[PDB]
Protein backbone atom coordinates (compact mmCIF):
# COMPACT_ATOMS: atom_id res chain seq x y z
CA UNK A 1 0.00 0.00 0.00
CA UNK A 2 0.80 3.73 -0.35
CA UNK A 3 1.60 4.44 3.31
CA UNK A 4 4.24 1.68 3.35
CA UNK A 5 5.78 2.86 0.05
CA UNK A 6 6.02 6.43 1.48
CA UNK A 7 7.59 5.15 4.69
CA UNK A 8 10.14 3.26 2.62
CA UNK A 9 11.03 6.50 0.81
CA UNK A 10 11.45 8.23 4.20
CA UNK A 11 13.86 5.50 5.26
CA UNK A 12 15.75 5.50 1.93
CA UNK A 13 16.28 9.28 1.83
CA UNK A 14 16.69 9.81 5.58
CA UNK A 15 13.80 12.30 5.36
CA UNK A 16 10.36 13.16 6.70
CA UNK A 17 7.84 13.17 3.85
CA UNK A 18 4.42 14.91 3.66
CA UNK A 19 1.87 14.25 0.90
CA UNK A 20 -1.68 15.41 0.14
CA UNK A 21 -3.87 14.94 -2.97
CA UNK A 22 -7.52 16.08 -2.53
CA UNK A 23 -10.34 13.72 -3.41
CA UNK A 24 -12.02 14.09 -6.80
CA UNK A 25 -15.11 12.50 -8.37
CA UNK A 26 -13.27 9.31 -9.41
CA UNK A 27 -10.34 9.24 -6.88
CA UNK A 28 -9.85 8.93 -3.14
CA UNK A 29 -7.78 11.46 -1.26
CA UNK A 30 -4.14 10.53 -0.60
CA UNK A 31 -2.66 11.64 2.74
CA UNK A 32 0.65 10.95 4.46
CA UNK A 33 1.70 13.22 7.37
CA UNK A 34 -0.74 15.59 5.74
CA UNK A 35 -1.50 17.56 8.92
CA UNK A 36 2.14 17.79 10.11
CA UNK A 37 3.86 21.19 9.72
CA UNK A 38 6.57 21.69 7.08
CA UNK A 39 8.31 24.92 6.19
CA UNK A 40 6.76 26.73 3.19
CA UNK A 41 10.03 27.83 1.64
CA UNK A 42 9.13 29.35 -1.77
CA UNK A 43 5.88 27.43 -2.16
CA UNK A 44 4.30 30.48 -0.53
CA UNK A 45 5.07 32.52 -3.68
CA UNK A 46 2.12 31.04 -5.59
CA UNK A 47 -0.54 32.22 -3.10
CA UNK A 48 1.50 35.43 -2.69
CA UNK A 49 0.98 36.19 -6.37
CA UNK A 50 -2.71 35.30 -5.98
CA UNK A 51 -3.01 37.81 -3.10
CA UNK A 52 -1.40 40.58 -5.16
CA UNK A 53 -3.68 39.77 -8.12
CA UNK A 54 -6.79 39.62 -5.89
CA UNK A 55 -6.24 42.90 -4.01
CA UNK A 56 -5.87 45.26 -7.00
CA UNK A 57 -7.34 45.71 -10.51
CA UNK A 58 -5.50 44.05 -13.45
CA UNK A 59 -3.97 47.41 -14.38
CA UNK A 60 -1.89 47.22 -11.15
CA UNK A 61 0.32 44.81 -13.13
CA UNK A 62 2.02 47.86 -14.72
CA UNK A 63 2.77 49.65 -11.45
CA UNK A 64 6.54 50.31 -11.26
CA UNK A 65 8.35 49.20 -8.08
CA UNK A 66 11.85 50.58 -7.43
CA UNK A 67 14.52 49.04 -5.27
CA UNK A 68 18.33 49.22 -4.74
CA UNK A 69 21.05 46.53 -5.00
CA UNK A 70 21.24 46.61 -1.18
CA UNK A 71 17.61 45.35 -1.29
CA UNK A 72 19.01 42.11 -2.92
CA UNK A 73 19.84 39.76 -0.01
CA UNK A 74 18.90 36.42 -1.69
CA UNK A 75 19.32 34.70 -5.06
CA UNK A 76 17.32 36.98 -7.36
CA UNK A 77 18.12 36.07 -10.99
CA UNK A 78 15.62 38.57 -12.45
CA UNK A 79 15.64 41.39 -9.86
CA UNK A 80 19.42 41.78 -10.16
CA UNK A 81 19.12 42.44 -13.88
CA UNK A 82 16.81 45.52 -13.34
CA UNK A 83 18.08 47.72 -10.43
CA UNK A 84 18.27 51.01 -12.48
CA UNK A 85 14.83 50.65 -14.17
CA UNK A 86 12.76 48.97 -11.42
CA UNK A 87 10.23 46.22 -12.18
CA UNK A 88 6.48 46.20 -12.69
CA UNK A 89 4.21 44.11 -10.44
CA UNK A 90 3.59 41.84 -13.41
CA UNK A 91 7.30 41.19 -13.90
CA UNK A 92 7.78 40.59 -10.17
CA UNK A 93 5.02 37.96 -10.22
CA UNK A 94 6.69 36.34 -13.23
CA UNK A 95 10.08 36.31 -11.48
CA UNK A 96 8.72 35.16 -8.12
CA UNK A 97 7.04 32.13 -9.64
CA UNK A 98 9.20 31.08 -12.56
CA UNK A 99 12.75 31.68 -11.31
CA UNK A 100 11.81 31.72 -7.62
CA UNK A 101 13.37 35.19 -7.28
CA UNK A 102 13.66 36.05 -3.55
CA UNK A 103 13.80 39.83 -3.92
CA UNK A 104 10.72 39.68 -6.18
CA UNK A 105 8.82 37.90 -3.42
CA UNK A 106 9.90 40.46 -0.81
CA UNK A 107 8.75 43.33 -3.03
CA UNK A 108 5.40 41.60 -3.63
CA UNK A 109 5.01 41.14 0.14
CA UNK A 110 5.66 44.88 0.61
CA UNK A 111 3.00 45.56 -2.02
CA UNK A 112 0.41 43.91 0.23
CA UNK A 113 1.35 46.39 3.00
CA UNK A 114 0.94 46.32 6.77
CA UNK A 115 3.39 45.08 9.45
CA UNK A 116 6.05 42.38 9.02
CA UNK A 117 6.85 43.73 5.54
CA UNK A 118 3.54 42.18 4.34
CA UNK A 119 3.76 38.77 6.07
CA UNK A 120 0.74 39.53 8.29
CA UNK A 121 -1.26 40.62 5.26
CA UNK A 122 -0.20 37.44 3.44
CA UNK A 123 -1.26 35.31 6.43
CA UNK A 124 -4.54 37.30 6.42
CA UNK A 125 -5.08 36.43 2.77
CA UNK A 126 -4.69 32.72 3.54
CA UNK A 127 -7.21 33.06 6.42
CA UNK A 128 -9.64 34.69 4.00
CA UNK A 129 -9.31 31.49 1.89
CA UNK A 130 -10.19 29.24 4.86
CA UNK A 131 -6.58 28.20 5.63
CA UNK A 132 -6.33 28.39 9.42
CA UNK A 133 -3.07 26.44 9.82
CA UNK A 134 -0.47 28.21 7.63
CA UNK A 135 1.54 31.23 8.65
CA UNK A 136 4.31 33.40 7.36
CA UNK A 137 6.46 35.46 9.73
CA UNK A 138 9.76 36.29 8.00
CA UNK A 139 10.87 37.53 4.59
CA UNK A 140 13.36 35.96 2.15
CA UNK A 141 15.86 34.50 2.81
CA UNK A 142 15.15 34.09 6.57
CA UNK A 143 11.90 32.12 6.03
CA UNK A 144 13.96 29.18 4.68
CA UNK A 145 16.10 28.93 7.90
CA UNK A 146 13.89 28.46 10.94
CA UNK A 147 15.01 25.66 13.22
CA UNK A 148 13.08 22.33 13.14
CA UNK A 149 9.99 22.41 15.42
CA UNK A 150 9.45 26.17 15.05
CA UNK A 151 5.92 26.80 13.64
CA UNK A 152 6.84 30.16 12.10
CA UNK A 153 6.83 30.06 8.28
CA UNK A 154 5.06 26.70 8.18
CA UNK A 155 2.09 25.14 6.40
CA UNK A 156 0.84 21.56 6.00
CA UNK A 157 0.40 19.46 2.86
CA UNK A 158 -3.36 19.41 3.51
CA UNK A 159 -3.66 23.15 3.91
CA UNK A 160 -1.43 24.22 1.00
CA UNK A 161 -3.14 21.73 -1.37
CA UNK A 162 -6.59 23.15 -0.63
CA UNK A 163 -5.29 26.71 -1.10
CA UNK A 164 -3.72 25.77 -4.48
CA UNK A 165 -6.94 24.01 -5.61
CA UNK A 166 -8.99 27.12 -4.76
CA UNK A 167 -6.60 29.35 -6.73
CA UNK A 168 -6.23 27.29 -9.93
CA UNK A 169 -9.33 25.00 -10.08
CA UNK A 170 -11.88 27.00 -8.01
CA UNK A 171 -13.06 30.59 -7.98
CA UNK A 172 -10.63 32.36 -5.65
CA UNK A 173 -9.55 34.47 -8.58
CA UNK A 174 -11.70 35.60 -11.56
CA UNK A 175 -10.77 33.94 -14.88
CA UNK A 176 -8.39 36.66 -16.19
CA UNK A 177 -6.23 36.77 -13.01
CA UNK A 178 -6.47 32.99 -12.68
CA UNK A 179 -5.05 32.50 -16.20
CA UNK A 180 -2.02 34.61 -15.36
CA UNK A 181 -1.23 32.65 -12.18
CA UNK A 182 -1.80 29.39 -14.04
CA UNK A 183 0.45 30.42 -16.98
CA UNK A 184 3.34 31.56 -14.72
CA UNK A 185 3.23 28.24 -12.89
CA UNK A 186 2.93 26.42 -16.23
CA UNK A 187 6.25 27.92 -17.39
CA UNK A 188 8.15 27.36 -14.12
CA UNK A 189 11.86 26.77 -14.71
CA UNK A 190 12.74 25.27 -11.29
CA UNK A 191 10.63 22.10 -11.00
CA UNK A 192 11.74 19.53 -13.61
CA UNK A 193 13.24 17.09 -11.10
CA UNK A 194 10.30 17.02 -8.68
CA UNK A 195 6.55 16.38 -9.27
CA UNK A 196 7.14 16.78 -13.04
CA UNK A 197 9.73 13.94 -13.00
CA UNK A 198 7.24 11.43 -11.48
CA UNK A 199 4.32 12.09 -13.82
CA UNK A 200 4.46 10.67 -17.40
CA UNK A 201 5.19 13.33 -20.11
CA UNK A 202 1.64 13.27 -21.57
CA UNK A 203 0.29 14.74 -18.27
CA UNK A 204 0.44 18.53 -18.00
CA UNK A 205 2.13 19.81 -14.79
CA UNK A 206 2.18 23.36 -13.40
CA UNK A 207 4.08 23.84 -10.11
CA UNK A 208 5.95 25.94 -7.59
CA UNK A 209 8.98 24.58 -5.73
CA UNK A 210 10.49 25.29 -2.36
CA UNK A 211 13.97 24.56 -1.08
CA UNK A 212 15.72 25.41 2.14
CA UNK A 213 18.10 24.55 4.90
CA UNK A 214 17.65 21.42 7.01
CA UNK A 215 17.28 19.44 3.79
CA UNK A 216 13.99 21.10 2.93
CA UNK A 217 12.49 20.38 -0.47
CA UNK A 218 8.89 20.93 -1.50
CA UNK A 219 6.79 21.02 -4.62
CA UNK A 220 3.11 22.02 -4.99
CA UNK A 221 1.42 21.28 -8.31
CA UNK A 222 -1.73 21.01 -10.31
CA UNK A 223 -1.55 18.12 -12.80
CA UNK A 224 -3.88 17.19 -15.75
CA UNK A 225 -4.33 13.67 -17.24
CA UNK A 226 -3.83 13.14 -21.00
CA UNK A 227 -7.66 13.36 -21.25
CA UNK A 228 -7.75 16.74 -19.27
CA UNK A 229 -8.79 15.53 -15.73
CA UNK A 230 -7.17 17.70 -12.96
CA UNK A 231 -5.48 16.75 -9.62
CA UNK A 232 -3.75 18.78 -6.92
CA UNK A 233 -0.43 17.42 -5.54
CA UNK A 234 1.45 18.78 -2.52
CA UNK A 235 4.68 17.06 -1.54
CA UNK A 236 6.83 18.37 1.31
CA UNK A 237 10.06 17.12 2.89
CA UNK A 238 12.94 17.81 5.21
CA UNK A 239 16.09 16.11 6.57
CA UNK A 240 16.31 18.12 9.75
CA UNK A 241 18.21 15.50 11.76
CA UNK A 242 21.13 16.04 9.40
CA UNK A 243 21.40 19.68 10.57
CA UNK A 244 21.26 23.11 8.99
CA UNK A 245 23.45 21.99 6.02
CA UNK A 246 21.58 18.73 5.23
CA UNK A 247 21.24 18.53 1.45
CA UNK A 248 17.73 18.54 -0.06
CA UNK A 249 16.83 15.32 -1.93
CA UNK A 250 14.88 16.15 -5.14
CA UNK A 251 14.56 12.44 -6.06
CA UNK A 252 12.40 11.85 -2.92
CA UNK A 253 9.74 14.14 -4.33
CA UNK A 254 9.98 12.60 -7.83
CA UNK A 255 9.60 9.13 -6.35
CA UNK A 256 6.73 10.18 -4.09
CA UNK A 257 5.08 11.78 -7.13
CA UNK A 258 5.59 8.48 -9.10
CA UNK A 259 3.63 6.65 -6.37
CA UNK A 260 0.87 9.25 -6.57
CA UNK A 261 0.71 8.99 -10.41
CA UNK A 262 0.50 5.17 -10.32
CA UNK A 263 -2.44 5.30 -7.91
CA UNK A 264 -4.25 8.06 -9.88
CA UNK A 265 -4.01 6.09 -13.19
CA UNK A 266 -5.93 3.19 -11.47
- Burial class for 257, CB neighbours closer than 10 Å (0-12, 13-18, 19+): buried
Calculate helix-pair angle for 45-55, 175-186, nearest 10 degrees. 150
In the chain, the number of structural domains is 1
* Backbone dihedral region for residue 224 (phi beyond 0: left; psi -120 to 50: alpha; all else: beta): beta
Q: Note whether 92 and 109 are within 8 A (CB).
A: no
Q: Note whether 99 and 77 are within 8 A (CB).
A: yes
DSSP 35: T
Report the DSSP beta bridge partners of residue 19: 32, 235
Q: Note whether 99 and 190 are within 8 A (CB).
A: yes
Other CB atoms closer than 10 Å to residue 226's CB: what's the count?
10
CATH of the domain at 137: 3.40.710.10
Task: Report the C-alpha gap between 39 and 211 in whole angstroms.
Answer: 9
Name, in order, each residue with C-beta under 8 angstroms of 25's C-beta and a sequence gap of 6 or more: none
Q: Are β-strands 204-212 and 216-224 bridged in parallel, bridged antiparallel, or unpaired? A: antiparallel
Name, in order, each residue with C-beta under 8 angstroms of 28's C-beta and a sequence gap of 6 or more: none
Other CB atoms closer than 10 Å to residue 41's CB: what's the count?
27
Q: Note whether 149 and 142 are within 8 A (CB).
A: no
Q: In Å, what resolution does this model reach? A: 2.5
Computed on alpha carbons and rounded to an integer, the radius of gyration of the chain in Å comes to 17
Domain hosting residue 238, numbered range = 1-266
Output the CA–CA distances (angstroms, integers) from residue 33 to 3, 186, 191, 221, 258, in the order listed. Answer: 10, 27, 22, 18, 18
Elucidated via = X-ray
Amino acid sequence: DLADRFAELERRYDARLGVYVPATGTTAAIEYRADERFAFCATFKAPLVAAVLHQNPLTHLDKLITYTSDDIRSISPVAQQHVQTGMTIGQLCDAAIRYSDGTAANLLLADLGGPGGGTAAFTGYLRSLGDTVSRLDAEEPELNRDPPGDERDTTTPHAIALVLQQLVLGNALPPDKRALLTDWMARNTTGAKRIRAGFPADWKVIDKTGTGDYGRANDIAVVWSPTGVPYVVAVMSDRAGGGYDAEPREALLAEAATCVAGVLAL
